[PDB]
């Protein structure tokens, strides 16, 4: 699964609304309506796509065919959940091979970790000694996407975000604008999402 | 935005030798690269539509690899059929789509001399009210053919019509037809008409004329 | 098999509308993607929008955003690209193109559609004869062809006998002439054996004005 | 009013594929079940699996998990079963039927579609005429027909006058011989003097030979 940093930015969360209506956005930890009025340090965005019916899988607390083995959720995650259908793009009429999905490992992993290693699963109990046979399968394989089949198996597009919560040197929020500075009066401020009201 | 660069511009070469052509971008793309040839004439084709993965129905002269913003395509035997325009171009918006500039291939032959051939005025240019010389070039390489006129034995430039094709493939010719138009006054108003023609693979520049009273 | 076709070549002037088609079938419409190209001479090629016509939804190019419309048709399986106001900077051809998202585009391509627009009239042309004199060729060939330069727009269509020859025949690229005109011409070859019984029957059509111009040619000499 | 298409018998080879196709049409295909039915000559039947399209539903049987695969296409409305690897043990024949869940699941049916798996060669059947004596025989109208000899293996399509001889036909199911071949005979009855103003003419047609053969039946005379 792929990820990407953001930061030094200026956002605006109200665009996303430019799209088809959605199967899934939700969020943990932070009301998505006033995402604008927060400023952040860091931004981790990942990316996959995922069979229909799996969708549910993204989600803390719970296990899976891939909670157990590929994308695992800590239990203290706050963030934000899109996932939005995807079969007027990602179909060819004689189906498509070209997607990979992990089947068998040793354990699950912790949270936030890749594997990608190519070690033949010792399902049997004679020694596969690094030969792939009888009981020593290949340890991923592949979907199936056709134009026709039902929505319960149409490909879906998944995002996941990730927060960090005014802990550092903020650098990305929203278009707010300055003002000047004025002391010695008894004032109302703001200052990065921390308000109150006194004396500067 | 997304800028390519294609290199170099123009190259030219021979049968039976190795042709390489490269293609360059502003910031790394992850193979997301194709090819398309399109020969003079409407359709545009696709020849490679990745990295290194050809398209079926064409044979095995193709080759080609890159990575990161380096890229090269390259045919191993260069064959007399191939005579066209070619472009790379990527893609990773879902919508922002671009094509490079353009390379340009040119045959190498034996110099050859050319076919010269006269074409005489018709009655019914006589009717419209202006006379041609109609001088036809055919067969001959390379492109140094030069067409001057002669009125009355007296010095014209410029003043002309011209008219010549692409490279073809089977001789490397680029057939020509030029033309000196005259008005009637211009015409009955003196006896004799020459092109001359020189070109550097003849052993001499030549010079056909023709009296009026020939007709 | 898969075949595509297009409406014809037009002229117009400024101010003014026009729309264009395109067509395709031998397999199922709904479930692959249409895109235009535009490309005009002297330059490169460069995208102009998509289209999946199965759920109606648009693309468009940042350079072109709020210029041109596109839609399409599923009862008859057809694509309809559209505008609204025309200028003088929009004489290019254009093509319309079949592709499929996950994997290749352009595996097949239109045949070509044109169109010009200015503020001139199309002026009828005149097609002038030349057959093969007593200047003729030693070993026995010959030529034949025909010249025309009081035509515009372009291109145009000339055929030799009731059929153009299927071999033997040539035609040069047209070239602009100082009357704010255009010229062109094509020949044919023809050896002494088959000219002692063919005739040319040489005939033009051309689309700006379409009036088909026949006429008869026999080789000739200069004889006194 | 409903209509079922199936194709004919095969013989193929251990090892090879295979695909079979059952093809129906009058009312709405989209809505209602297709399943397959095996049986085994000779002896009992047992079921196969069924098939929903439009929801693309797949239900196989206990004993066949695995080992075969169903599909549907709604364009033409068609049931398709394939193999995997042909097996010496599948020497049966293959019906499918239209079924819906809820009251009745025997509506309509098929024809049924031979398929055996050998390693030998067919063998190309003869038929010799065995005709009345010229004289009429204790029964006044005596007996006539043909007989086919040794042969491999089935089926065997056989006809009379093109059909035209239907009525007081009887004829014995094949054998196996000795000689590990197949033999048959079909025979009528009929009057000694109705072989001379019109013909009574045999052919048989091999499918796994694909090969047409003819006899005409003549009076025999009282030879020793």
Redesign the interface.
Same mark, same amino acid.
């Given at each position: 699964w792929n990820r990407k940093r953001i930061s030094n930015c200026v956002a605006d969360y109200s665009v996303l609304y430019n799209l088809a209506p959605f199967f899934t956005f939700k969020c943990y930890g932070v009301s998505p309506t006033k995402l604008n009025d927060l400023c952040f340090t860091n931004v981790y965005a990942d990316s996959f796509v995922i069979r229909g019916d799996e969708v549910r899988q993204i989600a803390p607390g719970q296990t899976g065919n891939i909670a157990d083995y590929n994308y695992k959720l800590p239990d203290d995650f706050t963030g934000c959940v899109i996932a939005w259908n995807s079969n +007027?793009?990602?179909? +060819?009429?004689s189906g /498509?091979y /070209?997607y990979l999905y992990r089947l068998f490992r040793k354990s699950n992993l912790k949270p936030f970790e890749r594997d990608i290693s190519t070690e033949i699963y010792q399902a049997g109990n004679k020694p596969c000694n690094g030969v792939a046979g009888f009981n020593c399968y290949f340890p991923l394989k592949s979907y199936s996407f056709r134009?026709?089949?039902?929505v319960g198996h149409q490909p879906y597009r998944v995002v996941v975000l990730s927060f960090e919560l005014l802990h550092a040197p903020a650098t990305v929020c929203g278009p707010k604008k300055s003002t000047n500075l004025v002391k010695n009066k008894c004032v109302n401020f703001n200052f990065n999402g921390l308000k109150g009201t006194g004396v500067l | 935005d997304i800028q390519m660069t294609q290199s170099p511009s123009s190259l030219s070469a021979s049968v039976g030798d190795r042709v390489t052509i490269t293609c360059q971008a502003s910031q790394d793309i992850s193979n997301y690269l194709n090819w398309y040839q399109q020969k003079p004439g409407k359709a545009p084709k696709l020849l490679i539509y990745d990295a290194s993965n050809l398209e079926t129905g064409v044979p095995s002269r193709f080759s080609g690899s890159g990575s990161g913003t380096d890229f090269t395509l390259t045919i191993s035997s260069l064959q007399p059929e191939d005579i066209a325009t070619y472009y790379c171009q990527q893609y990773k918006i879902l919508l922002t789509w671009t094509f490079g500039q353009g390379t340009k291939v040119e045959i190498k032959r034996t110099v050859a001399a050319p076919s010269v051939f006269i074409f005489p005025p018709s009655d019914e240019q006589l009717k419209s009210g202006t006379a041609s010389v109609v001088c036809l070039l055919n067969n001959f390489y390379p492109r140094e053919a030069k067409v001057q006129w002669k009125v009355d034995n007296a010095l014209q430039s410029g003043n002309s019509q011209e008219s010549v094709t692409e490279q073809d493939s089977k001789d490397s010719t680029y057939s020509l037809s030029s033309t000196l138009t005259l008005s009637k006054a211009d015409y009955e108003k003196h006896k004799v008409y020459a092109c001359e023609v020189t070109h550097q693979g003849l052993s001499s520049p030549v010079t056909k004329s023709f009296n009026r009273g020939e007709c | 098999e898969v075949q595509l076709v297009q409406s014809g070549a037009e002229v117009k002037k400024p101010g003014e509308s026009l729309k264009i088609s395109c067509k395709a079938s031998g397999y199922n419409f709904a479930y692959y993607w249409i895109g235009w190209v535009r490309q005009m001479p002297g330059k490169g090629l460069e995208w102009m929008g998509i289209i999946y016509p199965g759920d109606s939804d648009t693309r468009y190019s940042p350079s072109f955003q709020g210029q041109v419309t596109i839609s399409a048709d599923k009862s008859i399986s057809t694509a309809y690209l559209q505008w609204s106001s025309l200028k003088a900077s929009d004489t290019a051809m254009y093509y319309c193109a079949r592709g499929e998202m996950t994997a290749v585009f352009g595996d097949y391509w239109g045949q070509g559609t044109l169109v010009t627009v200015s503020s001139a009239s199309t002026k009828g042309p005149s097609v002038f004869p030349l057959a093969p004199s007593s200047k003729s060729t030693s070993g026995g060939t010959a030529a034949l062809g025909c010249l025309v330069k009081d035509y515009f727009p372009e291109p145009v269509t000339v055929s030799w006998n009731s059929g153009a020859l299927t071999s033997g025949v040539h035609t040069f690229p047209a070239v602009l002439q100082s009357s704010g005109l255009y010229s062109l011409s094509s020949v044919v070859t023809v050896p002494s054996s088959s000219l002692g019984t063919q005739t040319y029957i040489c005939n033009v059509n051309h689309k700006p004005s379409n009036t088909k111009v026949d006429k008869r040619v026999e080789p000739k000499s200069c004889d006194k």
């Open positions: +007027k793009l990602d179909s +060819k009429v /498509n /070209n134009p026709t089949y039902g | - | -």
